[PDB]
Amino acid sequence: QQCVKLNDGHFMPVLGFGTYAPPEVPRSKALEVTKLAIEAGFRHIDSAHLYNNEEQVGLAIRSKIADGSVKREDIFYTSKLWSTFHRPELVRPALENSLKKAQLDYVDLYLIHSPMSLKPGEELSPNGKVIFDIVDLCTTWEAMEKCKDAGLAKSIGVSNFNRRQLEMILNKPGLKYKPVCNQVECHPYFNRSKLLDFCKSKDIVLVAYSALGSQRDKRWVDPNSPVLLEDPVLCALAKKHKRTPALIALRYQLQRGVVVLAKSYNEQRIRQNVQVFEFQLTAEDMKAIDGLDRNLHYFNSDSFASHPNYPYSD
Ligand SMILES: NC(=O)c1ccc[n+]([C@@H]2O[C@H](COP(=O)([O-])OP(=O)(O)OC[C@H]3O[C@@H](n4cnc5c(N)ncnc54)[C@H](OP(=O)(O)O)[C@@H]3O)[C@@H](O)[C@H]2O)c1
Ligand SMILES: CC1(C)CC[C@@]2(CC[C@H]3[C@@H]4CCc5cc(C(N)=O)ccc5[C@H]4CC[C@@]32C)OC1=O
Protein backbone atom coordinates (compact mmCIF):
# COMPACT_ATOMS: atom_id res chain seq x y z
CA GLN A 1 0.00 0.00 0.00
CA GLN A 2 1.90 2.52 -1.77
CA CYS A 3 -1.08 4.46 -3.14
CA VAL A 4 -1.86 7.48 -5.26
CA LYS A 5 -4.56 10.03 -4.57
CA LEU A 6 -7.33 10.11 -7.15
CA ASN A 7 -8.92 13.32 -8.37
CA ASP A 8 -12.02 12.70 -6.21
CA GLY A 9 -10.01 12.34 -2.99
CA HIS A 10 -9.99 8.54 -2.77
CA PHE A 11 -6.77 6.50 -2.75
CA MET A 12 -5.72 3.71 -5.12
CA PRO A 13 -2.95 1.17 -4.45
CA VAL A 14 -0.37 1.41 -7.27
CA LEU A 15 -0.10 -2.37 -7.72
CA GLY A 16 -3.26 -4.30 -8.58
CA PHE A 17 -4.13 -7.98 -8.98
CA GLY A 18 -5.61 -8.99 -12.33
CA THR A 19 -8.38 -11.57 -12.01
CA TYR A 20 -9.32 -12.42 -15.61
CA ALA A 21 -8.88 -16.02 -16.69
CA PRO A 22 -10.32 -17.42 -19.92
CA PRO A 23 -13.54 -19.54 -19.84
CA GLU A 24 -11.60 -22.83 -19.93
CA VAL A 25 -10.19 -22.17 -16.43
CA PRO A 26 -12.48 -23.55 -13.69
CA ARG A 27 -14.39 -20.79 -11.87
CA SER A 28 -13.23 -22.01 -8.46
CA LYS A 29 -9.64 -21.02 -9.33
CA ALA A 30 -10.45 -17.30 -9.00
CA LEU A 31 -11.41 -17.88 -5.35
CA GLU A 32 -8.14 -19.66 -4.57
CA VAL A 33 -5.84 -17.20 -6.34
CA THR A 34 -7.53 -14.03 -5.07
CA LYS A 35 -7.00 -15.32 -1.53
CA LEU A 36 -3.34 -16.01 -2.40
CA ALA A 37 -3.02 -12.49 -3.83
CA ILE A 38 -4.37 -10.92 -0.65
CA GLU A 39 -2.05 -13.15 1.42
CA ALA A 40 0.93 -11.99 -0.70
CA GLY A 41 0.07 -8.34 -0.08
CA PHE A 42 -2.17 -7.30 -2.98
CA ARG A 43 -4.95 -4.95 -1.88
CA HIS A 44 -6.13 -3.58 -5.27
CA ILE A 45 -8.20 -6.28 -7.02
CA ASP A 46 -9.42 -5.86 -10.61
CA SER A 47 -12.59 -7.67 -11.80
CA ALA A 48 -15.47 -7.01 -14.24
CA HIS A 49 -18.88 -8.29 -15.30
CA LEU A 50 -17.18 -9.70 -18.41
CA TYR A 51 -14.96 -12.01 -16.33
CA ASN A 52 -17.73 -14.24 -15.01
CA ASN A 53 -15.81 -14.37 -11.70
CA GLU A 54 -17.26 -11.63 -9.46
CA GLU A 55 -18.89 -14.18 -7.13
CA GLN A 56 -15.60 -16.01 -6.65
CA VAL A 57 -13.47 -12.86 -6.33
CA GLY A 58 -16.05 -11.38 -3.93
CA LEU A 59 -16.02 -14.57 -1.84
CA ALA A 60 -12.22 -14.42 -1.60
CA ILE A 61 -12.40 -10.84 -0.31
CA ARG A 62 -15.16 -11.72 2.21
CA SER A 63 -13.19 -14.76 3.37
CA LYS A 64 -10.09 -12.65 4.09
CA ILE A 65 -12.25 -10.14 5.97
CA ALA A 66 -13.91 -12.98 7.93
CA ASP A 67 -10.62 -14.55 9.04
CA GLY A 68 -9.32 -11.13 10.16
CA SER A 69 -6.59 -10.76 7.52
CA VAL A 70 -7.98 -7.50 6.10
CA LYS A 71 -10.82 -5.05 6.64
CA ARG A 72 -13.10 -3.92 3.79
CA GLU A 73 -11.49 -0.46 3.88
CA ASP A 74 -8.09 -2.12 3.22
CA ILE A 75 -9.30 -3.52 -0.12
CA PHE A 76 -9.63 -1.52 -3.33
CA TYR A 77 -12.06 -3.47 -5.52
CA THR A 78 -12.79 -2.61 -9.13
CA SER A 79 -15.56 -3.79 -11.40
CA LYS A 80 -16.52 -2.68 -14.89
CA LEU A 81 -19.67 -1.91 -16.85
CA TRP A 82 -19.85 -4.27 -19.82
CA SER A 83 -20.44 -2.84 -23.31
CA THR A 84 -23.99 -4.15 -23.70
CA PHE A 85 -24.98 -1.89 -20.76
CA HIS A 86 -23.87 1.53 -22.07
CA ARG A 87 -27.43 2.82 -22.48
CA PRO A 88 -27.88 5.09 -19.43
CA GLU A 89 -30.90 3.27 -17.98
CA LEU A 90 -28.85 0.06 -17.82
CA VAL A 91 -25.84 1.42 -15.91
CA ARG A 92 -27.07 1.42 -12.31
CA PRO A 93 -28.75 -2.00 -12.68
CA ALA A 94 -25.47 -3.41 -14.09
CA LEU A 95 -23.54 -2.05 -11.09
CA GLU A 96 -26.18 -3.35 -8.66
CA ASN A 97 -25.89 -6.80 -10.21
CA SER A 98 -22.09 -6.70 -9.89
CA LEU A 99 -22.47 -5.76 -6.21
CA LYS A 100 -24.97 -8.60 -5.67
CA LYS A 101 -22.56 -11.09 -7.27
CA ALA A 102 -19.57 -9.97 -5.18
CA GLN A 103 -21.73 -9.62 -2.03
CA LEU A 104 -20.29 -6.13 -1.47
CA ASP A 105 -22.03 -2.89 -0.44
CA TYR A 106 -19.94 -0.78 -2.81
CA VAL A 107 -17.10 -1.05 -5.30
CA ASP A 108 -14.08 1.18 -4.83
CA LEU A 109 -13.98 1.79 -8.57
CA TYR A 110 -16.45 1.30 -11.41
CA LEU A 111 -15.22 1.64 -14.99
CA ILE A 112 -16.73 1.82 -18.42
CA HIS A 113 -14.93 -1.36 -19.63
CA SER A 114 -14.60 -0.22 -23.26
CA PRO A 115 -15.89 2.61 -25.50
CA MET A 116 -17.09 -0.02 -28.00
CA SER A 117 -20.84 -0.14 -27.28
CA LEU A 118 -22.65 -3.38 -28.12
CA LYS A 119 -26.28 -4.35 -28.74
CA PRO A 120 -28.16 -4.50 -25.41
CA GLY A 121 -29.09 -7.96 -24.14
CA GLU A 122 -27.56 -10.71 -22.01
CA GLU A 123 -25.24 -12.00 -24.73
CA LEU A 124 -21.71 -10.87 -23.84
CA SER A 125 -20.85 -10.80 -27.56
CA PRO A 126 -24.07 -10.24 -29.57
CA ASN A 127 -25.34 -13.56 -36.04
CA GLY A 128 -24.31 -11.81 -34.06
CA LYS A 129 -22.20 -10.24 -35.45
CA VAL A 130 -20.61 -8.64 -33.83
CA ILE A 131 -23.63 -6.34 -33.31
CA PHE A 132 -22.51 -2.79 -32.41
CA ASP A 133 -24.60 -0.06 -30.73
CA ILE A 134 -24.26 3.70 -31.24
CA VAL A 135 -24.45 5.36 -27.82
CA ASP A 136 -23.33 8.82 -26.76
CA LEU A 137 -20.86 7.87 -24.03
CA CYS A 138 -21.48 11.22 -22.35
CA THR A 139 -24.92 9.84 -21.45
CA THR A 140 -23.32 6.65 -20.09
CA TRP A 141 -21.01 8.89 -18.06
CA GLU A 142 -23.93 10.84 -16.58
CA ALA A 143 -25.35 7.51 -15.38
CA MET A 144 -21.95 6.57 -13.88
CA GLU A 145 -21.95 9.88 -11.99
CA LYS A 146 -25.34 9.01 -10.49
CA CYS A 147 -23.84 5.72 -9.27
CA LYS A 148 -21.12 7.63 -7.41
CA ASP A 149 -23.71 9.98 -5.90
CA ALA A 150 -25.73 6.94 -4.74
CA GLY A 151 -22.67 5.48 -2.97
CA LEU A 152 -22.59 2.33 -5.14
CA ALA A 153 -19.09 3.23 -6.39
CA LYS A 154 -16.59 5.27 -4.38
CA SER A 155 -14.86 6.31 -7.61
CA ILE A 156 -15.71 6.15 -11.30
CA GLY A 157 -13.44 5.93 -14.32
CA VAL A 158 -13.02 4.65 -17.85
CA SER A 159 -11.08 1.96 -19.67
CA ASN A 160 -9.73 1.66 -23.22
CA PHE A 161 -10.49 5.29 -24.03
CA ASN A 162 -8.18 7.22 -26.34
CA ARG A 163 -7.40 10.94 -25.87
CA ARG A 164 -10.34 12.11 -28.03
CA GLN A 165 -12.83 9.89 -26.19
CA LEU A 166 -11.53 11.10 -22.82
CA GLU A 167 -11.64 14.71 -24.03
CA MET A 168 -15.31 14.31 -25.00
CA ILE A 169 -16.14 13.41 -21.37
CA LEU A 170 -13.92 16.13 -19.88
CA ASN A 171 -15.49 18.88 -21.99
CA LYS A 172 -19.09 17.72 -21.55
CA PRO A 173 -21.42 20.50 -20.38
CA GLY A 174 -22.42 20.03 -16.74
CA LEU A 175 -19.70 17.48 -15.97
CA LYS A 176 -19.88 16.53 -12.30
CA TYR A 177 -17.00 14.08 -11.90
CA LYS A 178 -13.91 13.59 -14.01
CA PRO A 179 -12.94 9.98 -14.59
CA VAL A 180 -10.37 9.11 -11.91
CA CYS A 181 -8.46 6.83 -14.26
CA ASN A 182 -8.18 5.37 -17.74
CA GLN A 183 -7.26 1.66 -17.63
CA VAL A 184 -5.56 0.79 -20.94
CA GLU A 185 -3.22 -1.67 -22.60
CA CYS A 186 0.24 -0.50 -21.59
CA HIS A 187 3.66 -2.21 -21.59
CA PRO A 188 7.10 -1.66 -23.16
CA TYR A 189 5.85 -2.60 -26.65
CA PHE A 190 2.93 -0.13 -26.46
CA ASN A 191 3.89 2.38 -23.79
CA ARG A 192 1.14 4.99 -24.40
CA SER A 193 3.53 7.93 -23.83
CA LYS A 194 1.24 10.55 -25.35
CA LEU A 195 -1.88 9.25 -23.63
CA LEU A 196 0.05 9.16 -20.33
CA ASP A 197 1.15 12.78 -20.77
CA PHE A 198 -2.47 13.76 -21.49
CA CYS A 199 -3.85 11.87 -18.50
CA LYS A 200 -1.29 13.43 -16.13
CA SER A 201 -2.17 16.90 -17.46
CA LYS A 202 -5.83 16.26 -16.52
CA ASP A 203 -5.24 14.64 -13.09
CA ILE A 204 -6.34 11.24 -14.50
CA VAL A 205 -4.40 8.11 -13.46
CA LEU A 206 -3.30 5.74 -16.21
CA VAL A 207 -3.74 2.11 -15.14
CA ALA A 208 -1.79 -0.45 -17.19
CA TYR A 209 -3.24 -3.79 -18.22
CA SER A 210 -1.37 -6.51 -20.12
CA ALA A 211 1.69 -5.00 -18.42
CA LEU A 212 3.29 -8.46 -18.65
CA GLY A 213 2.45 -8.88 -22.35
CA SER A 214 -1.10 -10.27 -22.05
CA GLN A 215 -2.36 -13.83 -21.74
CA ARG A 216 -1.98 -14.16 -25.54
CA ASP A 217 -5.49 -15.60 -25.94
CA LYS A 218 -5.83 -16.98 -29.50
CA ARG A 219 -9.28 -15.33 -29.81
CA TRP A 220 -7.74 -11.86 -29.70
CA VAL A 221 -3.95 -12.04 -29.96
CA ASP A 222 -1.66 -12.96 -32.86
CA PRO A 223 0.59 -15.88 -31.79
CA ASN A 224 3.28 -14.28 -34.03
CA SER A 225 3.44 -11.22 -31.80
CA PRO A 226 6.78 -11.02 -29.98
CA VAL A 227 6.44 -12.33 -26.41
CA LEU A 228 7.08 -9.39 -24.09
CA LEU A 229 8.69 -11.42 -21.30
CA GLU A 230 11.15 -12.93 -23.81
CA ASP A 231 12.45 -9.52 -24.85
CA PRO A 232 16.29 -9.48 -24.69
CA VAL A 233 16.38 -5.97 -23.17
CA LEU A 234 14.00 -7.04 -20.37
CA CYS A 235 16.00 -10.23 -19.86
CA ALA A 236 19.30 -8.31 -19.67
CA LEU A 237 17.81 -5.92 -17.12
CA ALA A 238 16.45 -8.85 -15.12
CA LYS A 239 19.98 -10.32 -15.05
CA LYS A 240 21.52 -6.97 -14.11
CA HIS A 241 19.19 -6.53 -11.14
CA LYS A 242 18.80 -10.23 -10.29
CA ARG A 243 15.06 -9.96 -10.76
CA THR A 244 12.79 -11.32 -13.54
CA PRO A 245 11.57 -9.88 -16.84
CA ALA A 246 8.05 -9.58 -15.33
CA LEU A 247 9.40 -7.57 -12.40
CA ILE A 248 11.26 -5.25 -14.80
CA ALA A 249 8.06 -4.67 -16.78
CA LEU A 250 6.08 -3.88 -13.62
CA ARG A 251 8.75 -1.58 -12.17
CA TYR A 252 8.95 0.36 -15.43
CA GLN A 253 5.32 1.35 -15.02
CA LEU A 254 5.63 2.44 -11.40
CA GLN A 255 8.61 4.67 -12.23
CA ARG A 256 6.62 6.44 -14.98
CA GLY A 257 3.77 7.11 -12.54
CA VAL A 258 1.51 4.44 -14.02
CA VAL A 259 -0.60 2.21 -11.76
CA VAL A 260 0.06 -1.37 -12.83
CA LEU A 261 -2.01 -4.58 -12.83
CA ALA A 262 -0.54 -8.07 -12.85
CA LYS A 263 -2.55 -11.23 -13.44
CA SER A 264 -1.22 -14.54 -12.20
CA TYR A 265 -3.00 -17.74 -11.27
CA ASN A 266 0.28 -19.27 -10.07
CA GLU A 267 1.14 -19.10 -6.36
CA GLN A 268 4.87 -18.49 -6.89
CA ARG A 269 4.37 -15.75 -9.49
CA ILE A 270 1.70 -14.01 -7.36
CA ARG A 271 4.23 -13.84 -4.50
CA GLN A 272 7.01 -12.73 -6.87
CA ASN A 273 5.04 -9.83 -8.33
CA VAL A 274 4.82 -7.93 -5.02
CA GLN A 275 8.64 -7.69 -5.16
CA VAL A 276 8.16 -4.75 -7.56
CA PHE A 277 8.61 -2.46 -4.52
CA GLU A 278 12.02 -3.97 -3.62
CA PHE A 279 14.29 -2.50 -6.32
CA GLN A 280 14.80 0.37 -8.77
CA LEU A 281 15.63 0.96 -12.41
CA THR A 282 18.14 3.64 -13.36
CA ALA A 283 17.47 6.41 -15.88
CA GLU A 284 19.45 4.45 -18.47
CA ASP A 285 17.45 1.28 -17.68
CA MET A 286 14.25 3.28 -18.22
CA LYS A 287 15.58 4.67 -21.52
CA ALA A 288 16.42 1.15 -22.69
CA ILE A 289 12.85 0.07 -21.92
CA ASP A 290 11.41 3.17 -23.66
CA GLY A 291 13.34 2.08 -26.77
CA LEU A 292 11.13 -1.04 -27.01
CA ASP A 293 8.00 0.91 -27.97
CA ARG A 294 6.67 -0.51 -31.26
CA ASN A 295 2.92 0.21 -31.42
CA LEU A 296 2.03 -3.39 -30.55
CA HIS A 297 -1.39 -3.76 -28.98
CA TYR A 298 -1.76 -7.47 -28.30
CA PHE A 299 -5.55 -7.24 -28.45
CA ASN A 300 -5.96 -7.01 -32.20
CA SER A 301 -8.95 -8.70 -33.83
CA ASP A 302 -11.30 -8.25 -36.76
CA SER A 303 -14.10 -8.80 -34.23
CA PHE A 304 -13.57 -5.23 -32.95
CA ALA A 305 -11.06 -3.40 -35.25
CA SER A 306 -13.99 -2.18 -37.36
CA HIS A 307 -16.13 -0.98 -34.43
CA PRO A 308 -17.05 2.70 -34.99
CA ASN A 309 -15.68 3.51 -31.51
CA TYR A 310 -12.54 1.33 -31.69
CA PRO A 311 -9.94 3.52 -29.93
CA TYR A 312 -6.78 2.68 -31.87
CA SER A 313 -5.67 4.52 -34.99
CA ASP A 314 -4.25 1.55 -36.91
N1 LIG B 1 -9.83 -3.11 -19.10
C1 LIG B 1 -9.59 -4.09 -19.97
O1 LIG B 1 -10.17 -4.13 -21.22
C2 LIG B 1 -8.64 -5.19 -19.63
C3 LIG B 1 -8.01 -5.92 -20.64
C4 LIG B 1 -7.03 -6.85 -20.28
C5 LIG B 1 -6.71 -7.01 -18.93
N2 LIG B 1 -7.36 -6.30 -17.95
C6 LIG B 1 -7.06 -6.48 -16.51
O2 LIG B 1 -5.66 -6.55 -16.34
C7 LIG B 1 -5.29 -7.82 -15.82
C8 LIG B 1 -3.88 -8.18 -16.26
O3 LIG B 1 -3.73 -8.17 -17.67
P1 LIG B 1 -3.65 -9.54 -18.51
O4 LIG B 1 -4.79 -10.41 -18.14
O5 LIG B 1 -3.51 -9.15 -19.92
O6 LIG B 1 -2.34 -10.29 -17.97
P2 LIG B 1 -0.83 -9.79 -17.63
O7 LIG B 1 -0.85 -9.12 -16.30
O8 LIG B 1 -0.22 -9.07 -18.78
O9 LIG B 1 -0.11 -11.20 -17.41
C9 LIG B 1 0.09 -12.05 -18.53
C10 LIG B 1 0.62 -13.39 -18.05
O10 LIG B 1 1.82 -13.19 -17.32
C11 LIG B 1 1.99 -14.32 -16.48
N3 LIG B 1 2.78 -13.89 -15.31
C12 LIG B 1 2.33 -13.20 -14.22
N4 LIG B 1 3.37 -12.97 -13.40
C13 LIG B 1 4.48 -13.52 -13.95
C14 LIG B 1 5.81 -13.59 -13.54
N5 LIG B 1 6.20 -13.01 -12.40
N6 LIG B 1 6.71 -14.24 -14.36
C15 LIG B 1 6.32 -14.80 -15.56
N7 LIG B 1 5.01 -14.72 -15.96
C16 LIG B 1 4.12 -14.09 -15.17
C17 LIG B 1 0.59 -14.83 -16.13
O11 LIG B 1 0.51 -16.23 -16.29
P3 LIG B 1 0.19 -17.15 -15.00
O12 LIG B 1 -1.24 -16.90 -14.57
O13 LIG B 1 0.39 -18.58 -15.46
O14 LIG B 1 1.16 -16.78 -13.92
C18 LIG B 1 -0.34 -14.10 -17.10
O15 LIG B 1 -1.24 -14.96 -17.78
C19 LIG B 1 -6.43 -8.75 -16.23
O16 LIG B 1 -6.47 -9.96 -15.49
C20 LIG B 1 -7.60 -7.82 -15.97
O17 LIG B 1 -7.82 -7.73 -14.58
C21 LIG B 1 -8.32 -5.40 -18.30
C1 LIG C 1 -8.83 -1.58 -26.80
C2 LIG C 1 -9.83 -2.66 -27.18
C3 LIG C 1 -10.33 -2.41 -28.59
C4 LIG C 1 -9.15 -4.03 -27.13
C5 LIG C 1 -10.12 -5.18 -26.88
C6 LIG C 1 -10.81 -5.00 -25.52
C7 LIG C 1 -9.82 -5.26 -24.37
C8 LIG C 1 -10.10 -6.68 -23.84
C9 LIG C 1 -11.11 -7.25 -24.84
C10 LIG C 1 -11.99 -8.45 -24.46
C11 LIG C 1 -11.20 -9.74 -24.19
C12 LIG C 1 -12.12 -10.81 -23.61
C13 LIG C 1 -13.46 -10.87 -24.34
C14 LIG C 1 -14.30 -11.95 -24.05
C15 LIG C 1 -15.54 -12.08 -24.68
C16 LIG C 1 -16.42 -13.25 -24.34
N1 LIG C 1 -17.56 -13.39 -24.88
O1 LIG C 1 -15.97 -14.17 -23.49
C17 LIG C 1 -15.94 -11.12 -25.61
C18 LIG C 1 -15.10 -10.03 -25.91
C19 LIG C 1 -13.86 -9.91 -25.27
C20 LIG C 1 -12.96 -8.77 -25.61
C21 LIG C 1 -13.75 -7.54 -26.09
C22 LIG C 1 -12.81 -6.37 -26.45
C23 LIG C 1 -11.93 -6.02 -25.25
C24 LIG C 1 -12.81 -5.48 -24.11
O2 LIG C 1 -11.42 -3.70 -25.44
C25 LIG C 1 -11.00 -2.57 -26.22
O3 LIG C 1 -11.64 -1.53 -26.08
From Swiss-Prot:
UniProt site (Lowers pKa of active site Tyr): K80
Functional pathway: Steroid metabolism
Catalytic reaction(s) noted: a 3alpha-hydroxysteroid + NADP(+) = a 3-oxosteroid + NADPH + H(+); a 3alpha-hydroxysteroid + NAD(+) = a 3-oxosteroid + NADH + H(+); prostaglandin F2alpha + NADP(+) = prostaglandin D2 + NADPH + H(+); prostaglandin F2alpha + NADP(+) = prostaglandin H2 + NADPH + H(+)
Activity: how regulated: Strongly inhibited by nonsteroidal anti-inflammatory drugs (NSAID) including flufenamic acid and indomethacin. Also inhibited by the flavinoid, rutin, and by selective serotonin inhibitors (SSRIs). The oxidation reaction is inhibited by low micromolar concentrations of NADPH.
Top-level EC class: oxidoreductase
Gene Ontology CC: cytoplasm; cytosol; extracellular exosome; nucleus
Major subcellular site: cytoplasm
Pfam family for this entry, one: Aldo_ket_red
Location(s), subcellular: Cytoplasm
Name of the featured protein: Aldo-keto reductase family 1 member C3
GO terms under biological process: cellular response to calcium ion; cellular response to corticosteroid stimulus; cellular response to jasmonic acid stimulus; cellular response to prostaglandin D stimulus; cellular response to prostaglandin stimulus; cellular response to starvation; daunorubicin metabolic process; doxorubicin metabolic process
Entry-linked CDD domains: AKR_AKR1C1-35
Gene: AKR1C3
Positions of NADP(+) binding: 19-20, 46, 159-160, 183, 209-215, 263-265, 269-273
UniProt xrefs under InterPro entries: AKR (IPR020471), AKR1C (IPR044482), Aldo/ket_reductase_CS (IPR018170), NADP_OxRdtase_dom (IPR023210), NADP_OxRdtase_dom_sf (IPR036812)
GO molecular function terms listed in the Swiss-Prot or TrEMBL record: 15-hydroxyprostaglandin-D dehydrogenase (NADP+) activity; 5-alpha-androstane-3-beta,17-beta-diol dehydrogenase (NADP+) activity; aldo-keto reductase (NADPH) activity; aldose reductase (NADPH) activity; all-trans-retinol dehydrogenase (NAD+) activity; all-trans-retinol dehydrogenase (NADP+) activity; androstan-3-alpha,17-beta-diol dehydrogenase (NAD+) activity; androsterone dehydrogenase [NAD(P)+] activity
Positions contributing to substrate binding: H113
Species per Swiss-Prot/TrEMBL record: Homo sapiens
Effect noted on mutating R219Q: Decrease in the retinaldehyde reductase activity. Exhibits changes in both KM and kcat values
Entry EC no(s): 1.1.1.-, 1.1.1.210, 1.1.1.53, 1.1.1.62
Annotated site location: Important for substrate specificity: L50
Family according to the record: Belongs to the aldo/keto reductase family.
